[PDB]
């Protein structure tokens, strides 16, 4: 489906309808310093490493909508439940 | 599975050892103090169990009795010489340098004074080709060109007993008798005729290797069998 | 040739004998070692914890 790059809607921050802008969420980069990271290095030794010896799973036929909603005025974003969509194209 | 036969060897059990105690003498050149003086006469010609070839029993001036790797044409009474300036006849032993080129040589040394390592089996002969102040190129029997220290002693002539390989063993019995005088387990059962547990080629409902016979050099012992690091195979091509 | 009865008949070789050290007939005269007290193998006497229940 196609979707407007900008449109009006409620801004949970301002508490009033403003023109928001939609962007597909870009994955942040990791620091490899979280607690989970430490445990990996800490609990991995000789032989099988339990959980840390597993590999990434598979994928669902279609992914959900992973968007960010930016408020034209205050400039703060907010998230929304997503919906399965083979592809998502923005309009303008 | 179980260790393959190739692994049972390494352990050095009776079945794999050579009947050392039944061997005669460790053939090695002499520690001629120097000068080349040393010389001696041939006494008897004995059979060397370890090599299926003859060995000349020798007695020297200092009265030291020792058996020596005997080249072809060497009889009782003959007078052998060993040193830096011995003659240039078959039998005498001297550093490569003092040896004229194009001359068939046997029982060659790798490290000067090591007693001899190269060319020393029924009929084989080495070949001194190039001379130098440093290098003494010797074409070994395998064909390779071994670059050697001119100080490495060697013997003139071809090893005795040449042509042994010409007559076939004909019957197992003969092979048997020969094998019994060597450090080897014989007869030989083919892997392909063994059970899986016993050899990487074992198993099947019919005899044939499981995977391809050519194996990597990195294969571990227990799995290195068949055609080891073969650069190619077959007669064809 | 059965491995049973018929092979019992060749057993006339002496191995274990009265032990000079512990008095048991466990001194292997061909090995010169007692399988009971360890005489001939060790100065300390042969003894293992598995010769009795763990908590005893």
């Amino acid at each position: 489906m196609q979707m407007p790059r900008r449109f009006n809607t409620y801004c949970p921050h301002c508490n009033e309808h403003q023109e928001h802008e939609v962007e597909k969420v870009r994955s942040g980069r990791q620091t490899g310093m979280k607690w989970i990271d430490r445990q990996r290095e800490r609990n991995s030794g000789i032989g099988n490493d339990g959980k840390f010896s597993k590999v990434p799973g598979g994928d669902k036929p279609t992914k959900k909508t992973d968007l960010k909603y930016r408020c034209g005025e205050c400039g703060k974003a907010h998230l929304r439940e997503g919906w399965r969509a083979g592809r998502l194209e923005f309009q303008e | 599975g179980r260790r393959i036969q190739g692994q049972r060897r390494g352990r050095g059990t009776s079945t794999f050892r050579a009947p050392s105690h039944r061997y005669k003498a460790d053939l090695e050149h002499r520690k001629v103090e120097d000068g080349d003086v040393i010389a001696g006469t041939v006494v008897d010609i004995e059979h060397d169990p370890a090599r299926s070839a003859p060995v000349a029993a020798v007695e020297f001036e200092d009265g030291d009795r020792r058996l020596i790797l005997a080249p072809e044409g060497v009889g009782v009474g003959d007078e052998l010489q060993v040193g830096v300036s011995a003659e240039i006849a078959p039998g005498n032993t001297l550093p490569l340098a003092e040896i004229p080129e194009g001359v068939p040589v046997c029982n060659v040394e790798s490290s000067p004074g090591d007693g001899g390592k190269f060319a020393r089996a029924s009929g084989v002969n080495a070949q001194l080709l190039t001379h130098d102040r440093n290098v003494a190129v010797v074409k070994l029997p395998s064909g390779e060109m071994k670059r050697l220290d001119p100080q490495c002693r060697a013997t003139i002539g071809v090893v005795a007993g040449g042509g042994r390989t010409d007559k076939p063993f004909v019957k197992a019995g003969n092979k048997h008798h020969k094998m019994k005088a060597r450090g080897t387990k014989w007869p030989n059962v083919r892997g392909v005729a063994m059970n899986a547990v016993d050899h990487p080629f074992g198993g099947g409902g019919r005899q044939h290797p499981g995977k391809p016979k050519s194996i990597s050099r990195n294969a571990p012992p227990g799995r290195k069998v068949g055609d080891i690091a073969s650069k190619r195979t077959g007669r064809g091509g | 040739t059965g491995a049973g009865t018929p092979s019992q008949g060749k057993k006339n070789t002496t191995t274990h004998t009265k032990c000079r050290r512990c008095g048991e007939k466990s001194y292997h005269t061909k090995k010169k070692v007692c399988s009971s007290c360890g005489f001939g193998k060790s100065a300390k006497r042969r003894d293992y914890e598995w010769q009795s229940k763990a908590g005893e």
Partner: protein, 194 residues
């Protein structure tokens, strides 16, 4: 003023610099050709020896002991083991090479007892430590106040029971507080968890 000793000591702060460097490059050679346990008449590090309890007296012996460098010399499993327990290469022993040395030495001198030991260098494949031993039966020692204690029966075979200093240290008994819950008063009494 700085004791003469203080120099011997300060020199070993960096066994790889100056005179002590060349000295080592030289000794190790005569060393790599000596045995496993070599009694020597005088300590290579007088400051340390004296410090640890040495004393040019009778009944006091010294010996240099070499021990192979590296991890445990372990044999792979010949029976079923879960992955965790199939290791060989990275397994290390829980007794430091120094303690290994104190024992090899003490066994060479059955009548003596280990007083202390210190390191004296290491080439590419081995480590040398000098061990101070004591004749608990010599009257020269039975009468020396700063040492007669080591004559007590309860001091017998002290190195094999970890009473040596390097032993108590290797036993996690350094700290008296946090961290030593499973070490004091004994490893075995704490069900071997330290």
């Amino acid at each position: 003023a700085r004791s003469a000793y203080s120099y011997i000591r300060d020199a070993w702060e960096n066994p790889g610099d100056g005179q002590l460097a060349e000295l080592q490059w030289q000794r190790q050679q005569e060393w790599r050709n000596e045995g496993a346990v070599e009694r020597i008449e005088r300590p290579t590090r007088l400051d340390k020896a004296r410090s640890q309890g040495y004393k040019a007296k009778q009944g006091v012996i010294v010996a240099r002991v070499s021990v192979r460098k590296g991890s445990a010399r372990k044999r792979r499993h010949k029976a079923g083991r879960r992955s965790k327990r199939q290791g060989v290469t990275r397994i290390t022993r829980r007794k430091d090479i120094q303690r290994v040395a104190e024992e090899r030495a003490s066994r060479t001198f059955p009548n003596l007892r280990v007083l202390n030991s210190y390191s004296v260098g290491q080439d590419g494949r081995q480590k040398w430590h000098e061990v101070i031993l004591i004749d608990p039966n010599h009257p020269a020692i039975q009468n020396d106040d700063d040492l007669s204690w080591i004559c007590a029966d309860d001091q017998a075979d002290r190195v094999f029971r970890g009473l040596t200093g390097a032993g108590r240290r290797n036993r996690g008994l350094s700290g008296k507080g946090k961290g030593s819950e499973k070490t004091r008063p004994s490893l075995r009494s704490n069900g071997g968890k330290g």
